[PDB]
């Protein structure tokens, strides 16, 4: 039924790794990354979407607090309600809270719907990654080992299933008997493997990778 390995970068569905800096905007980068892939699949164009638009505009009404944190689910609902999100090129990332400056002239995507997956189900997450595209997730990143990660399949014995950092699952695989999730972070290219981390998969929802998964869709019409 499902492929043993997936890597959506190979289909040209994933934009360059971004750098969040001192603004706690991982939630926004995680949401735009998932939508960028659906935009590519639908239109054939790969376009970075504006994380800053989410930080500045998907705020208290959506239970978000910009650089202090937020949620991918309500970021998607903002895009739905707003009938768009701007390109990153038109509305670039400044790592600061700003006045909402959404301009529909520069709309680069819409969102038709989003779907939340069941907590802790790594099987369901695997299916969504294979059959839908990259999936927005949270992870527990409050361990020095995460910040210091350079390469390999990451396993942190003190990790919890409680999440605090948004990332994007762009694939999965197995390196000689160690299964992993292929994860895009937003701490620049100097983090991990060119901005990516391979995180232990089917090890009991390691670091809460499958705790709160969601993905958007852009439908024909």
Kindly list the residues in this chain that would bind ligand BFV in the complex (CB under 6 A): 24, 26-27, 30, 63-65, 68-71, 73-74, 138, 162-166, 211-212
Least distance from ligand BFV to the Cβ atom of residue 141, Å: 9
As separate numbers, helices (DSSP H) first and strands (DSSP E) second, the chain gives 5, 10
Question: Nearest approach, Cβ of 106 to ligand BFV (angstroms)?
Answer: 26
SS3 content of the chain, % helix, strand, coil (to 5): 30, 25, 50
Minimum CB distance to ligand BFV smaller for 87 or for 160: 160
Residue 209: name the closest of 175, 176, 172, 177 by CA: 172
Strand partners, 154: 199
Q: Are strands 196-200 and 178-184 parallel, antiparallel or unpaired?
A: antiparallel
Q: Which residue is nearest to ligand BFV (CB)?
A: 69
What span, in angstroms and rounded, lies between the C-alpha atoms of 88 and 96?
Answer: 15
The smaller minimum CB distance to ligand BFV, of residues 48 and 64, is found at: 64
Instruction: Tell me the closest approach of the beta carbon of residue 74 to ligand BFV, in angstroms.
Output: 5
CA distance 34 to 42: 13
Minimum Å distance from CB 119 to ligand BFV? 9
For ligand BFV, the closer CB: 12 or 118: 118
Nearer to ligand BFV, 46 or 96 (CB): 96
Q: Which residues contact 196 (CB under 8 A, 6 or more apart)?
A: 17, 170, 182, 183, 184, 185
101 vs 162 by CB, closer to ligand BFV: 162
Q: Shortest gap between Cβ of 157 and ligand BFV (angstroms)? A: 19
Least distance in angstroms from the C-beta of 151 to ligand BFV: 23
**27 neighbors 72 (Cβ within 8 angstroms):** yes
State which residue, 117 or 175, has the beta carbon closest to ligand BFV: 117
Q: Are 95 and 71 in contact (CB under 8 A)?
A: no
Judging by beta carbons within 10 Å of its beta carbon (0-12, 13-18, 19+), is residue 83 exposed, middle or buried?
exposed
């Amino acid at each position: 039924i499902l492929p043993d390995s997936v890597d959506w970068r190979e289909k040209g569905c994933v934009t360059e790794v971004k750098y969040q800096g001192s603004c706690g905007a991982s939630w926004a980068f995680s949401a735009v990354g998932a939508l960028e892939a659906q935009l590519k699949l639908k239109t054939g164009k790969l376009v970075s979407l504006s994380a800053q638009n989410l930080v500045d505009c998907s705020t208290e009404k959506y239970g978000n607090k910009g650089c202090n944190g937020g949620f991918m689910t309500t970021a998607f609902q903002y895009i739905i309600d707003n009938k768009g999100i701007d390109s990153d090129a038109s509305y670039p990332y400044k790592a600061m809270d700003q006045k909402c400056q959404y301009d529909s002239k520069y709309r680069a995507a819409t969102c038709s719907k989003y779907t939340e997956l069941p907590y802790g189900r790594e099987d369901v997450l695997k299916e969504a990654v294979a059959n839908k595209g990259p999936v927005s997730v949270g992870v527990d990143a409050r361990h020095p080992s995460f910040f210091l990660y350079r390469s390999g399949v990451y396993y942190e014995p003190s990790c919890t299933q409680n999440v605090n950092h948004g990332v994007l699952v762009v694939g999965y695989g197995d390196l000689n008997g160690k299964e992993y999730w292929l994860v895009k972070n937003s701490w620049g290219h100097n983090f991990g493997e060119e901005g990516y981390i391979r995180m232990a998969r089917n090890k009991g929802n390691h670091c809460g990778i499958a705790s709160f998964p969601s993905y958007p869709e852009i439908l024909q019409g």
